[PDB]
Design a protein around this ligand. Structure first.
Ligand SMILES: [O+]
Length: 225
């Protein structure tokens, strides 16, 4: 029951190992979260093989404990409730008319630092599709993330669409199916149905020559009066 761990600014570390259609890569990220304001600031670096997929396709994979829950909705905040021991976050992300990512992550504290450790596996991508062909714009839309309690175990089920702008003016849809379960065996907050309203802004540091992404993100829970 870790809501109180998030009242201040919390350092964040993200570590991802990925394989998409046999193309192996890794990403490290650092920054900080201020859940009081629903706020994230992170910088990510691609650290091994050439990144085989567009940065925007990794945003959702690369810490929903930093969402701002309104006071009246605090009983619905599963994510913070599982801390400090943490939660497993698992997804399948279906890119319309293309491949899928399957991800497994553990989100937990290591001392003062909120860590997201991820393995990502992508299969069934098209060689010259929007993903492997790097045809997605370097930007990010605003989404609604729908959350419900898991009725069969101590967790949540989450579903949402993201829309990734394509360089030709079109849109690449990504349908996300997600499950979160506590790592510990203690109680968690099982929510009524609600959603998170998200927005993200992607940028680059002109002085950073490694392949990287700077992210500023704001997320607020909503849907319960
Ligand atoms: O790191």
């Amino acid at each position: 029951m870790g809501e109180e761990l998030f009242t201040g600014v919390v350092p964040i570390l993200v570590e991802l190992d990925g394989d998409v259609n046999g193309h192996k890569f890794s990403v490290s990220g650092e920054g900080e979260g201020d859940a009081t304001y629903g706020k994230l600031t992170l910088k990510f670096i691609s650290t091994t093989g050439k990144l085989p997929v567009p940065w925007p396709t990794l945003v959702t994979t690369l810490v929903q404990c930093f969402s701002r829950y309104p006071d009246h909705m605090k009983r619905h905040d599963f994510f913070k409730s599982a801390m400090p021991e943490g939660y497993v976050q698992e997804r399948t992300i279906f890119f319309k008319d293309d491949g899928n990512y399957k991800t497994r992550a553990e989100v937990k504290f290591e001392g003062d630092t909120l860590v997201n450790r991820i393995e990502l596996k992508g299969i069934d991508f098209k060689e010259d599709g929007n993903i492997l062909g790097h045809k997605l714009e370097y930007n990010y839309n605003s989404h609604n993330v729908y959350i419900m309690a898991d009725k069969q175990k101590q967790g949540i089920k989450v579903n949402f669409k993201t829309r990734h702008n394509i360089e030709d003016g079109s849109v690449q849809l990504a349908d996300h199916y997600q499950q979160n379960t506590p790592i510990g065996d203690g109680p968690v907050l099982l929510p009524d149905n609600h959603y998170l309203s998200t927005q993200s802004a992607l940028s680059k540091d002109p002085n950073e020559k490694r392949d990287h992404m700077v992210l500023l993100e704001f997320v607020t829970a909503a849907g319960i009066t």
